Design an enzyme around this catalytic site. Structure first.
Site, PDB file in Angstrom:
ATOM      1  N   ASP A  13       0.787  -1.225   0.000  1.00 22.81           N
ATOM      2  CA  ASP A  13       0.000   0.000   0.000  1.00 22.81           C
ATOM      3  C   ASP A  13       0.827   1.288   0.000  1.00 22.81           C
ATOM      4  O   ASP A  13       0.306   2.367   0.329  1.00 22.81           O
ATOM      5  CB  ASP A  13      -0.947  -0.002   1.203  1.00 22.81           C
ATOM      6  N   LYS A  65     -11.987  -4.407  -3.519  1.00 22.78           N
ATOM      7  CA  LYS A  65     -13.200  -4.439  -2.699  1.00 22.78           C
ATOM      8  C   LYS A  65     -14.437  -4.079  -3.509  1.00 22.78           C
ATOM      9  O   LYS A  65     -15.209  -3.182  -3.154  1.00 22.78           O
ATOM     10  CB  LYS A  65     -13.048  -3.562  -1.456  1.00 22.78           C
ATOM     11  N   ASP A  68     -20.120  -2.552  -6.241  1.00 23.19           N
ATOM     12  CA  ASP A  68     -21.053  -1.825  -7.086  1.00 23.19           C
ATOM     13  C   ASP A  68     -22.214  -2.715  -7.522  1.00 23.19           C
ATOM     14  O   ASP A  68     -22.358  -3.857  -7.040  1.00 23.19           O
ATOM     15  CB  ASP A  68     -20.320  -1.264  -8.311  1.00 23.19           C
ATOM     16  N   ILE A  69     -23.077  -2.177  -8.379  1.00 25.29           N
ATOM     17  CA  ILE A  69     -24.123  -2.982  -9.012  1.00 25.29           C
ATOM     18  C   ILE A  69     -23.504  -4.033  -9.950  1.00 25.29           C
ATOM     19  O   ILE A  69     -22.356  -3.902 -10.364  1.00 25.29           O
ATOM     20  CB  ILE A  69     -25.133  -2.109  -9.787  1.00 25.29           C
ATOM     21  N   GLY A 179      -3.174  -5.151  15.189  1.00 22.70           N
ATOM     22  CA  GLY A 179      -3.140  -5.869  16.454  1.00 22.70           C
ATOM     23  C   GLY A 179      -3.259  -7.376  16.385  1.00 22.70           C
ATOM     24  O   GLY A 179      -3.124  -8.060  17.406  1.00 22.70           O
ATOM     25  N   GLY A 195       0.785  -5.617   5.879  1.00 20.79           N
ATOM     26  CA  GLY A 195       1.177  -4.393   5.190  1.00 20.79           C
ATOM     27  C   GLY A 195       2.218  -3.596   5.950  1.00 20.79           C
ATOM     28  O   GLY A 195       3.417  -3.810   5.790  1.00 20.79           O
ATOM     29  N   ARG A 196       1.755  -2.691   6.805  1.00 23.25           N
ATOM     30  CA  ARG A 196       2.636  -1.723   7.455  1.00 23.25           C
ATOM     31  C   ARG A 196       3.803  -2.295   8.256  1.00 23.25           C
ATOM     32  O   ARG A 196       4.891  -1.749   8.204  1.00 23.25           O
ATOM     33  CB  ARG A 196       1.820  -0.769   8.325  1.00 23.25           C
TER      34      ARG A 196
HETATM   35  O1  LIG Z   1     -26.845   2.262  -6.008  1.00 20.15           O
HETATM   36  C1  LIG Z   1     -26.143   2.615  -6.938  1.00 20.15           C
HETATM   37  C2  LIG Z   1     -24.999   3.410  -6.727  1.00 20.15           C
HETATM   38  C3  LIG Z   1     -24.272   3.776  -7.821  1.00 20.15           C
HETATM   39  O2  LIG Z   1     -23.184   4.558  -7.667  1.00 20.15           O
HETATM   40  N1  LIG Z   1     -24.658   3.360  -9.070  1.00 20.15           N
HETATM   41  C4  LIG Z   1     -23.872   3.779 -10.241  1.00 20.15           C
HETATM   42  O3  LIG Z   1     -24.660   4.696 -11.031  1.00 20.15           O
HETATM   43  C5  LIG Z   1     -24.516   4.402 -12.442  1.00 20.15           C
HETATM   44  C6  LIG Z   1     -25.841   3.883 -13.011  1.00 20.15           C
HETATM   45  O4  LIG Z   1     -25.625   3.840 -14.422  1.00 20.15           O
HETATM   46  P1  LIG Z   1     -26.895   3.413 -15.305  1.00 20.15           P
HETATM   47  O5  LIG Z   1     -27.829   4.676 -15.559  1.00 20.15           O
HETATM   48  O6  LIG Z   1     -26.185   2.955 -16.654  1.00 20.15           O
HETATM   49  O7  LIG Z   1     -27.654   2.317 -14.673  1.00 20.15           O
HETATM   50  C7  LIG Z   1     -23.378   3.373 -12.549  1.00 20.15           C
HETATM   51  O8  LIG Z   1     -22.130   4.066 -12.698  1.00 20.15           O
HETATM   52  C8  LIG Z   1     -23.441   2.641 -11.197  1.00 20.15           C
HETATM   53  O9  LIG Z   1     -22.151   2.147 -10.841  1.00 20.15           O
HETATM   54  C9  LIG Z   1     -25.786   2.609  -9.243  1.00 20.15           C
HETATM   55  O10 LIG Z   1     -26.185   2.244 -10.344  1.00 20.15           O
HETATM   56  N2  LIG Z   1     -26.503   2.247  -8.176  1.00 20.15           N
HETATM   57  O1  LIG Z   2     -10.881  -6.285   6.593  1.00 18.71           O
HETATM   58  C1  LIG Z   2      -9.901  -5.896   5.963  1.00 18.71           C
HETATM   59  C2  LIG Z   2      -9.791  -6.136   4.588  1.00 18.71           C
HETATM   60  C3  LIG Z   2      -8.681  -5.678   3.942  1.00 18.71           C
HETATM   61  O2  LIG Z   2      -8.517  -5.915   2.627  1.00 18.71           O
HETATM   62  N1  LIG Z   2      -7.711  -4.995   4.632  1.00 18.71           N
HETATM   63  C4  LIG Z   2      -6.545  -4.534   3.865  1.00 18.71           C
HETATM   64  O3  LIG Z   2      -5.391  -5.288   4.271  1.00 18.71           O
HETATM   65  C5  LIG Z   2      -4.258  -4.407   4.472  1.00 18.71           C
HETATM   66  C6  LIG Z   2      -3.913  -4.321   5.972  1.00 18.71           C
HETATM   67  O4  LIG Z   2      -2.654  -3.634   5.974  1.00 18.71           O
HETATM   68  P1  LIG Z   2      -1.904  -3.448   7.384  1.00 18.71           P
HETATM   69  O5  LIG Z   2      -1.098  -4.762   7.745  1.00 18.71           O
HETATM   70  O6  LIG Z   2      -0.954  -2.202   7.078  1.00 18.71           O
HETATM   71  O7  LIG Z   2      -2.895  -3.151   8.449  1.00 18.71           O
HETATM   72  C7  LIG Z   2      -4.646  -3.053   3.840  1.00 18.71           C
HETATM   73  O8  LIG Z   2      -4.357  -3.027   2.425  1.00 18.71           O
HETATM   74  C8  LIG Z   2      -6.168  -3.039   4.049  1.00 18.71           C
HETATM   75  O9  LIG Z   2      -6.777  -2.223   3.047  1.00 18.71           O
HETATM   76  C9  LIG Z   2      -7.833  -4.784   5.961  1.00 18.71           C
HETATM   77  O10 LIG Z   2      -6.960  -4.195   6.594  1.00 18.71           O
HETATM   78  N2  LIG Z   2      -8.926  -5.231   6.603  1.00 18.71           N
END
Ligand SMILES: O=c1cc(O)n([C@@H]2O[C@H](COP(=O)(O)O)[C@@H](O)[C@H]2O)c(=O)[nH]1
Ligand SMILES: O=c1cc(O)n([C@@H]2O[C@H](COP(=O)(O)O)[C@@H](O)[C@H]2O)c(=O)[nH]1
Lengths: 219, 218
Positions: A13, A65, A68-69, A179, A195-196
């Site tokens: 990261d 992670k 989205d839809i 932790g 990570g860290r």
């Molecule tokens: O609840 C949600 C939240 C969103 O950001 N979006 C986003 O809004 C857009 C919807 O596009 P569309 O009008 O083609 O369905 C997409 O970019 C989608 O990722 C969604 O559709 N529903």
């Molecule tokens: O539940 C989760 C899921 C994750 O992907 N992560 C990811 O795992 C890594 C944890 O890094 P760190 O050892 O520095 O805490 C980060 O990239 C974080 O985004 C997390 O810490 N907790």
């Protein structure tokens, strides 16, 4: 399941190319599996995945992670796999259709999905925790084989392992900085994400070697 | 936020040429573009600066931020560095994760939009039952901007009730997903529209059509 060297996955990261490449290069003798997330990807481009493969020949887990839809999830997975990621991390909380969209792309492209169940940070207790057992069960029903669960809550990690079974693959972040204990986490997880405590160390290689020494009997 | 024609273009085309052409074709109708991971992961975060240079539009970065606080901070910083005016953040991962984004936004003079309930069928499984509480959490945290679903106007109305008329609410799910522009604007300040515009035979006529249909609400 993927064969993760030393049961240890680097969470890279750092947010600039030069540092990310240096540190990953330094620990490569200990780790063949690297998790690359948005901190690095948004700073340096998806082509960073290609650069890591070229330089280190490490497996790459893209920590997107995905949350989205279904339609947008498909696009995210396609772009991420096109870039060379071996696997992608997907949130379960947006529900089964959103997960299935990712699984469908992964099947088409010959790659893997990891389903994130419960998260490791304190905020996870508000909403995610109460859904996590069901999210895991949903994963099992959808045929998901790879999962992510929290080091910071051994009781929850244990339960998640129960739900998904011994044959599923489970990786766990929260070790070190947040932790969690490496050895204790490996009672349930196949591999720990760190990570860290590696990438911020004066000597990342020594830090990784030290974690490995501490779990030597588990390898 | 002052959104022209109450209409936000969701630019989810995945190649630069098409994204720029289509956005150019509808530019007279909008001043706000939502750019998400389909475009950013295909073409790079530099595409945000390119939109600002070409169109001088406001940019909402649709990151669905959903990580731990430490990583959320990094994602927001990277996103705002790229020139985004605002970022979309999931509420489901809890208050600390949201606060992390609020902190960075405040530091860089940007806005956070809190996604409460989502518009797709899967949202009913886990998100919907948490959504009212996520909205209240937003209120507690001082969040002023929210996202809720065009596909469930009764849920969108409840979200409006919780956050109040002073808060700013944008809503996706219009068109392709089944939501109606006019009904949605009973409760949301602006509608988000992707495919109904960018996949249309004539995107400009599509945007014009939508705006004609809500003419009385502008
Ligand atoms: O609840 C949600 C939240 C969103 O950001 N979006 C986003 O809004 C857009 C919807 O596009 P569309 O009008 O083609 O369905 C997409 O970019 C989608 O990722 C969604 O559709 N529903
Ligand atoms: O539940 C989760 C899921 C994750 O992907 N992560 C990811 O795992 C890594 C944890 O890094 P760190 O050892 O520095 O805490 C980060 O990239 C974080 O985004 C997390 O810490 N907790």
């Amino acid at each position: 399941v993927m064969d993760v060297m030393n049961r240890l996955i680097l969470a890279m990261d750092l947010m600039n190319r030069d540092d990310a490449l240096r540190v990953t290069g330094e620990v490569r003798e200990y780790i063949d599996t690297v998790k690359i997330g948005y901190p690095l990807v948004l700073s340096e481009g998806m082509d960073i995945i290609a650069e890591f493969r070229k330089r280190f020949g490490c497996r790459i887990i893209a920590d997107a992670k995905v949350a989205d839809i279904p339609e947008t999830n498909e696009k995210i997975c396609r772009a991420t796999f096109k870039a060379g990621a071996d696997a992608i991390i997907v949130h379960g909380f947006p529900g089964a259709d959103s997960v299935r969209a990712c699984l469908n792309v992964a099947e088409e492209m010959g790659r893997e999905v990891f389903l994130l169940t419960e998260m490791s940070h304190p905020g996870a207790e508000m909403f995610i925790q109460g859904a996590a057992d069901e999210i895991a069960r949903m994963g099992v029903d959808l045929g998901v084989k790879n999962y992510v669960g929290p080091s910071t809550r051994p009781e929850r990690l244990s339960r998640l392992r129960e739900i998904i079974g011994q044959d599923s693959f489970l990786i766990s972040p929260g070790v070190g900085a947040q932790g969690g204990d490496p050895g204790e986490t490996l009672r349930f997880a196949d591999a720990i994400i760190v990570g860290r405590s590696i990438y911020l160390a004066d000597n990342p290689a020594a830090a990784a070697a030290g974690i490995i020494e501490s779990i030597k009997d588990l390898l």
